[model samples]
Target chain A: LPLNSDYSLLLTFIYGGRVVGKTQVHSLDCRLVAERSDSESSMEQVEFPKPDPLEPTQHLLNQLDRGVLVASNSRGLFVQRLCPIPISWNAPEAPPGPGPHLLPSNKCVELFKTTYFCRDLAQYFQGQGPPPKFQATLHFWAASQENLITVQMEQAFARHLLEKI
Target chain B: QLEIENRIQGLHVDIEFLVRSIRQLKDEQDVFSFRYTVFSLKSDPHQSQQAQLVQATANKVDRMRKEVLDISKGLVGRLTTLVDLLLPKLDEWKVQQAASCIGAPPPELQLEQLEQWLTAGAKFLFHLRQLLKQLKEMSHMLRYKGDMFGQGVDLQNAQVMELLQRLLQRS
Candidate 1:
């Protein structure tokens, strides 16, 4: 697989955010499997943080919440909030489904900090003459101390956008 | 119950250690056998002296056997220690399990009770498996011994492996 084609966007979320501004992104991979029709795809969370010099602040955090999305391509997307974090810390639910364009760029910045993003890309592509499996892995990167606060703000903003998409 | 669990856990640790030691012994035996084989093949065939060859070959075989037996004896001591550690714990768990069965077992026990019993059973199986795996590994190492020594003198033993596997499955 050409890593650039499958992973360029996600990797950019990691390296780009660090390069542009300090952001601590907590993300996991998820896959969406359709119920009746055979279709699935991958959904990703790209969080940007509000940079700070030390201790980047988290805008929205989940206490205990989990979300599952089944894409048209038979890929299953899952998002979950870990323990001790408020469900409403970000938004309690996933964005209404159907199209990727529904997600706003600004909201992407809100939910991006300290967020756990996940997707299972392989299950969707199991049978189709070896269709490329959708794979999403959870990633974590703390903001550089110089841009901690800025990175955190970006994450909060990205998380907010996540709920709407 | 807690004391019993501790003993069972200790037995499992002892079995794992025994398996590791057995692997080390097998490796050493293989190295020594290889060395002896090379030493034999390099002998001068043109000498044509039967008595001299017999004396020298017998001396070599005796030295090799003694060295290998010394190592095997050390392994046997470890195996005996493991058996000692396990036998008492195994007997204790059997008694406890039998005692627990006296009052007609519940449909489904609590997590704690389930864990206690399961730990006992699993510990027994784990040790048995470890023993079997070690013996099987030993037999595999010993398969080449016939090539180095004469065919009849080779010790092709797998009784320990079979017994351990049967015990594990039954438990």
Candidate 2:
């Protein structure tokens, strides 16, 4: 579907194994477009051209030197990255134990410092993207922080995010 | 009676721990609700709608807190009743033991009575343990739902409401 006045798009770039930058574009005259090739076993290569100069296409292109690109609109979120990258995105291994370990990451802990962190993120996910399913995923994701320490950390982050907003 | 009393004492410690945990859960809820209220107002354009949901969430937390208090009260009440029932029987048993020691034809130690009292005491302890388990489950729900609410994520409000309702009904 074509972009409209009410639609906003955010492109987040991950470089050097970290979210280096994010670009938000409000209102687009042309449709945000993506094209993909079919391959059963091989990874699919998708292309999303810069819709307009008024947007942050240049900024996104400048950082395209070997990174992952994640895009989101009022309807859905999308991600694109080269396969077999020389970075390990594996989850941190659990300490040797008989049962599962439960805790949030330091990175997740750090993110909560921003105010309205979850609220703002939810707004984008709900307002522009797939509302029901994404919201459900978000719900489960938030609930997974079970331990007191993790919950407290998340609570701190939520407070910080709200303060910023 | 001694053995039952020992068991009850142990359960009492467990109950204390659960109460402390519940209090901590309530505090967490308060902190979460406050932050959620602020975030919804500032970040969500549907402020009024979000505000109402936040209010409903706070109300749920309050209801859960009250329920926990009620369960704790019930547990303590049952325990007190069991203790009262045991005390008289305990005195009688002590007297019997003393008479037997003094060679008084072993005044038929109320074996059946002691057995009954022990059974009753054990039953109360069982109930207390069940209540404590329920409280722990409630604590889990509070933490899970509270976190989801704080993040502006859509919760299964109906499911959670039903779960809390069932808990109340069970109690």
Candidate 3:
């Protein structure tokens, strides 16, 4: 059966070191809704759900407030669990962008953690028990900061946990 | 002398094949090393020790591969030089045999020297084949060890919990 809105979910967005926008996502079928900002000429409000005061999704929402959000459940269970591609910000030929393409030193670490999180979330939704255990294969390409070329690429089995409801 | 030259040509083909095999082995070793590193990072502190061993093995394979390549290059150079030196001797022996016409054999010393060179060339080829076999065994060893570690992770589901804990903490 498809998960219903009663399952309790939250979505949030952050930009420039603060929560730029928030919304309530009742169902897993939600989409990213955006609109032009009347106040900031160059900015826009990308709608995501404000976390419910009491919900499991708040855990994910709280993390978004501290740092840039890399992936979220709304993207789909399995789709979001896959690892992100490591990018080179210091390429000689600048990528097409406004400016400031730098990333934090711990980017690779965060990506690795996020991949695990996605796997865990998928297992949480599928398994039936007080504690649900899930299995996944984490695959990603890791590159060195000094050289833009990928230094390591790997895929390995990983297990995740989903706490009892 | 003609037979010796023909054997050299055959050795050249075998060396070329061995070179390609070594290149392929090196490529697989690189891939294995990358996976070991990633798996190590995902493993718990206790399990990381085992992961470290896999990574170390990968490094060993890499170093051995380099040594094999170096040795193979030197062997190829030696073979090329041997061929160069032998070709002219064979041509001279052929001219002498034709002129003599009455089945007059080439110089006894020259024939002996040619036989010794052929024997050395055959030994070199044999050693290279052994090196290739050793490389194949190493590759299989790496794959076996990597799979063993991977199976452990799958069985425990420890990686999943680790990821969840890290994500929750950061969140």
* Top TM-score hit: 2
TM-score of chain B of each: 0.41, 0.46, 0.47
Q: After TM-score superposition, what is the CA distance of residue B52 in candidate 1 from its true location, in Å?
A: 16
* Residue A6 displacement (Å), model 1: 64
Q: Estimate how well candidate 2 is docked, as a DockQ score.
A: 0.01
Tens digits of per-residue lDDT, candidate 2, B63-119, equal 655555554555555555555556666667677888888886564646676666555
For candidate 3, what is the recovered fraction of reference interface contacts?
0.00
TM-score of 1: 0.26
Q: Candidates 1 and 2: which is better by TM-score?
A: 2
- Give each model's whole-structure lDDT: 0.33, 0.38, 0.39
Worst 10 residues of 2 chain A by lDDT: A147-156
lDDT of 3 by residue, B1-171 (tens): 566666666666766666565654544453344334334343223335345545565665555555555555555555656645654665676678676687776544465666566456645545564554455455454435445433432322333233334323422
Model 3: colliding residue pairs: A23-A48, A23-A49, A23-A50, A159-B160, A160-B160
Cα RMSD, each candidate = 23.9, 19.9, 22.1
lDDT of 2 at A95: 38
Task: Score candidate 2 by TM-score against the native.
Answer: 0.33
Query: Which lDDT tens digits does candidate 1 get at residues B105-124?
Result: 43332445544544454445
Alpha-carbon runs more than 4 Å astray in model 2: A1-165, B1-44, B107-171
- Maximum-lDDT candidate: 3
For model 1, residues A75-155, the per-residue Cα lDDT tens digits are: 112233222222221221234556331222112112221112222123323433322212233232222322221111122
